[PDB]
Amino acid sequence: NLTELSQQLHDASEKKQLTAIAALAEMGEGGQGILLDYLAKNVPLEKPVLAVGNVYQTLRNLEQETITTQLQRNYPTGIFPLQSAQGIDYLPLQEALGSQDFETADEITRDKLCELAGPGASQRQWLYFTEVEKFPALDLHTINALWWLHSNGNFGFSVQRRLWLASGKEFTKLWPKIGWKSGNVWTRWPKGFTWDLSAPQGHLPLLNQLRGVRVAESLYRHPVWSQYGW
Numbered sequence: 001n002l003t004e005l006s007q008q009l010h011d012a013s014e015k016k017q018l019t020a021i022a023a024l025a026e027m028g029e030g031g032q033g034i035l036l037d038y039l040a041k042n043v044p045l046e047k048p049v050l051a052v053g054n055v056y057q058t059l060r061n062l063e064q065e066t067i068t069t070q071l072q073r074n075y076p077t078g079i080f081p082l083q084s085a086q087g088i089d090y091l092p093l094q095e096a097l098g099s100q101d102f103e104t105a106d107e108i109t110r111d112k113l114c115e116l117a118g119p120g121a122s123q124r125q126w127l128y129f130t131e132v133e134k135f136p137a138l139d140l141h142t143i144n145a146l147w148w149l150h151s152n153g154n155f156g157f158s159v160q161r162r163l164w165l166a167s168g169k170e171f172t173k174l175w176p177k178i179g180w181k182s183g184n185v186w187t188r189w190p191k192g193f194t195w196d197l198s199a200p201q202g203h204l205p206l207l208n209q210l211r212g213v214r215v216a217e218s219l220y221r222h223p224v225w226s227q228y229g230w
């Protein structure tokens with residue numbers, strides 16, 4: 001029933017929107033048309049809205065020529081403003097996420113964080129915790145929004161932060177929860193990681209622990225999360 005499923009999508013219950021979206025996408029032209037109209041009425045986003053990310057990504061994931069063409073033409077930069085306090089280009093990150101190429105997205109994200117930190121970090125290819133503390137909130141919001149919107153809320157530093165808070169800020173409890181350690185065994189980069197949505201909540205983006213937790217803690221304590229309601 002397309003009418004009733006459309007109504008379910010346009011009602012205000014997030015949980016019921018998500019089941020309606022999944023059903024509509026499998027209902028051919030009529031269902032896909034309802035989803036395309038939902039994007040037209042809700043994109044560009046101002047604030048991240050999970051259901052809108054799910055509509056976009058569900059349609060991309062069909063990998064059908066005409067839908068993909070239409071999405072690229074109407075939403076060439078995706079659904080979320082690609083804003084940066086340093087003029088950085090986040091389109092390649094968006095493109096990797098829209099293709100569900102999470103490994104490429106992780107690599108791009110790591111490079112962009114060094115670019116954001118400046119020439120010293122770009123040169124050495126790793127961060128100091130004080131550089132993280134000084135990141136502009138806007139860039140972290142753009143980066144996180146893309147991860148979250150393109151992963152059904154499963155990925156993003158905001159997701160890790162809330163799991164870290166749920167763990168009493170105990171990093172040794174966080175690592176197993178996000179799949180980065182299994183008992184005594186550290187998940188080996190890159191081959192040990194799960195580069196798809198079967199991964200546990202918070203699995204990506206990665207934060208190497210070779211130089212300790214200081215970068216991750218500074219990232220999770222950054223004012224961006226409270227500022228933007230993450």
Ligand SMILES: C/C=C1\C(=C\C2=NC(=C\c3[nH]c(/C=C4\NC(=O)C(CC)=C4C)c(C)c3CCC(=O)O)/C(CCC(=O)O)=C2C)NC(=O)[C@@H]1C
Nearest residue numbers: 110125126175180181186187188189206207208209210211
């Ligand atoms: C021995 C055990 C450890 C270890 C070793 C190590 N990691 C390396 C690289 C590297 N690991 C990650 C990610 C992770 N690696 C993990 O184990 C985990 C689970 C917490 C994550 C999430 C990324 C993204 C890069 C590329 C970016 C970068 O190099 O920073 C290198 C090569 C260093 C080099 O060649 O210079 C070495 C030797 N890393 C650790 O976390 C533990 C304690």
Ligand SMILES: [Cl-]
Nearest residue numbers: 128129214215
């Ligand atoms: Cl550090």
